[PDB]
Amino acid sequence: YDIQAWKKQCEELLNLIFQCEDSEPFRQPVDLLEYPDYRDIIDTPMDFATVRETLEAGNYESPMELCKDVRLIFSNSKAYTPSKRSRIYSMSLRLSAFFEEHISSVLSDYKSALRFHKR
Ligand SMILES: CN1Cc2ccccc2NC1=O
């Protein structure tokens, strides 16, 4: 029932994401010189370095807020892809499946801890 445990669990999951080859396109903000129409399509850019910096600054209150920003990385990739068969988008689908498999217990434990605090 530790209300604070989610933070270190999210730091460890971000470390695993950075080691995976499938994160390479998503580690830093999308390069606008490479993709000059990116901001005509994508209203709110997001990347894993931004997520980690937000966490380490103490600017997430819950793992739900971190989970919203990570899902935005994947939805932006889907909106920018010319094909569902693209390389970068296919890396995004494997990395999304890995993320969802590991964040499920972080969310469940946090929400259980809050309910116990309010019992
Ligand atoms: C082919 N692309 C290009 C791309 C650039 C930046 C972010 C996401 C994507 N998605 C794609 O599938």
Residue count (the chain)? 119
Closest ligand 1 atom to Cα of 35: 5
CB-neighbour burial class of residue 38 (10 A; exposed 0-12, middle 13-18, buried 19+): middle
CA 10 – CA 25 distance, rounded (Å): 20
As a whole number of Å, the end-to-end CA separation of the chain is 12
Structure solved via: X-ray
Whether the CB-CB separation of 60 and 9 falls below 8 Å is answered with no
Tell me the three state secondary structure of residue 112: helix
Helix axes 6-19, 48-56, angle to 10 degrees: 150
CA 80 – CA 3 distance, rounded (Å): 37
CA 42 – CA 83 distance, rounded (Å): 16
Widest CA span of the chain, in angstroms? 53
Ligand 1 first shell, C-beta below 6 A: 25, 30, 35, 77, 80-81, 86, 88-89
CA 104 – CA 45 distance, rounded (Å): 24
Instruction: List the one residue out of 90, 68, 106 whose CA is nearest residue 21.
Output: 90
Instruction: List the one residue out of 98, 110, 105, 108 whose CA is nearest residue 73.
Output: 98
What residues contact 12, with CB distance under 8 A and at least 6 apart?
A: none
Whether the CB-CB separation of 26 and 48 falls below 8 Å is answered with yes
What is the resolution of the experimental data for this entry, in Å?
Answer: 1.2
CA–centroid distance, residue 119 to ligand 1 (Å): 46
The CA-based angle 99-101-102, given to 5 degrees, is 70
Domain containing residue 49: 1-119
Q: How many domains does the chain have?
A: 1
Write the single-letter amino acid at 103.
I
The residue whose CA has the least distance to atom 7 of ligand 1 is 77
CA 64 – CA 66 distance, rounded (Å): 6
